[PDB]
Amino acid sequence: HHHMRVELLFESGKCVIDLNEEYEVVKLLKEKIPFESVVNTWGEEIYFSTPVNVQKMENPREVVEIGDVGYWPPGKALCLFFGKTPMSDDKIQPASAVNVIGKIVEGLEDLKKIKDGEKVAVRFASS
């Protein structure tokens, strides 16, 4: 394991993500935690901007799976995929390629409760 558990605390719920530190963007996110951001939704994707800009993607994907965590360089955003985006009817299609850097491991079911504009506290997981 070179993985790190990050807790995301929203207003309406919370989750834990597991991120692979082998990816440059994850190494840099590590150095910025703790930070806070603000949530946006796009269908069943939550995304929020981060203070890390890494354009190069070691693992770009133009289709993702339920539970995937992506980094989207155009918006410098972490993206949480829990269902379909407005882009497709038979798969989860991000707007453009995202660097799939980890997985939602707890609280996947809380995500549908999160509204646009909720603050998020980005933290290392306490367990």
Side-chain angles (χ1 to χ4, degrees), residues 6-98:
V6 166
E7 183 178 15
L8 314 176
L9 303 92
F10 308 98
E11 302 168 16
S12 294
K14 34 160 205 154
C15 70
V16 178
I17 65 184
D18 187 301
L19 304 175
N20 188 342
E21 307 182 53
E22 292 182 346
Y23 292 114
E24 189 62 29
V25 71
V26 181
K27 302 192 179 214
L28 295 178
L29 279 167
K30 186 160 168 183
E31 289 160 18
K32 300 290 183 168
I33 293 171
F35 70 89
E36 293 80 52
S37 189
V38 180
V39 160
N40 312 282
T41 62
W42 195 53
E44 295 179 352
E45 175 200 332
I46 283 158
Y47 69 104
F48 54 91
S49 80
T50 76
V52 173
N53 174 21
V54 180
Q55 297 299 310
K56 181 218 73 312
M57 297 181 279
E58 301 96 327
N59 188 37
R61 298 297 177 101
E62 285 183 336
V63 174
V64 305
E65 307 288 312
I66 284 161
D68 278 355
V69 173
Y71 173 86
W72 189 57
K76 297 107 183 187
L78 271 174
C79 307
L80 316 176
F81 298 91
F82 51 101
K84 290 172 182 72
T85 69
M87 301 266 63
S88 168
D89 73 348
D90 60 18
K91 86 251 297 156
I92 307 184
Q93 186 171 338
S96 60
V98 295

